[PDB]
Design a protein around this ligand. Sequence first.
Ligand SMILES: COc1ccc2c(c1)C(=O)[N+](C[C@@]1(c3ccc(-c4cccnc4)cc3)NC(=O)NC1=O)=C2
Ligand SMILES: [Zn+2]
Length: 258
Amino acid sequence: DPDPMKNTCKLLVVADHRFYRYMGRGEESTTTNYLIELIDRVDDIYRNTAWDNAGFKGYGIQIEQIRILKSPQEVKPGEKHYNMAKSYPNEEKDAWDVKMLLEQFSFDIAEEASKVCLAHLFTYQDFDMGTLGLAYGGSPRANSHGGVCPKAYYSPVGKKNIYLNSGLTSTKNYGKTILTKEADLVTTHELGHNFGAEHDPDGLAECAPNEDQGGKYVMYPIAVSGDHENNKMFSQCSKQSIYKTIESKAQECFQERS
Ligand SMILES: COc1ccc2c(c1)C(=O)[N+](C[C@@]1(c3ccc(-c4cccnc4)cc3)NC(=O)NC1=O)=C2
Ligand SMILES: [Zn+2]
């Protein structure tokens, strides 16, 4: 019998009412299929990366559970929820303030997020300044305040434990639905932050090549289009950061590939 390999970060995937209506065409099957195919293509990127440029490969992601929120969350006055009909803090805007939305999703999904490596929200809202997603950055440290593997942080206001093993992806930008190849890269980038990578800096040519050299890698701070070969790959900078996080945290919460 082969030795067990805890090499898979299991995900709770949530599609809010906005995603369900505008991406899933108001259908469970259409919503599910989009998310399953997207996670699998993102998994091909992770699972195939040799994090240490040798044998530290086969580390990826798998959906553990899909939660579909078919309707907006009914809220009482002064109450907020990441799945409510209105955007917060400004109801006049198409989208929430992205940082407040991530905080709100982490607060509301807490009980479910405590049981998975990562929780990821899929929404359909046009965040300001070309923002397509947000995630808490991971690290090898036990008290990382985010990323892979749930760690309880108590909320005195909520009187409960909250977890920062979260991220979100929007498939809406500049009033339109983004291409699927763009959506795959956003989730890759967000999970990249969760797995411990920071943005690729301009100061290290190796991690930020010119367009004639295959373009930028996935963790570049200006969102890659997917048009260039490097777009769907992690730079050597991301590989070193992620390798250190995985090495420390796979034994904590990664599981066998299902
Ligand atoms: C390939 O997909 C992407 C590549 C690069 C990026 C993105 C997507 C994307 O949304 N962004 C913006 C961005 C971001 C980060 C912080 C804040 C922020 C900070 C403090 C207070 N309020 C908000 C807003 C947006 N989201 C992300 O994952 N990285 C960022 O730079 C870069
Ligand atoms: Zn980023």
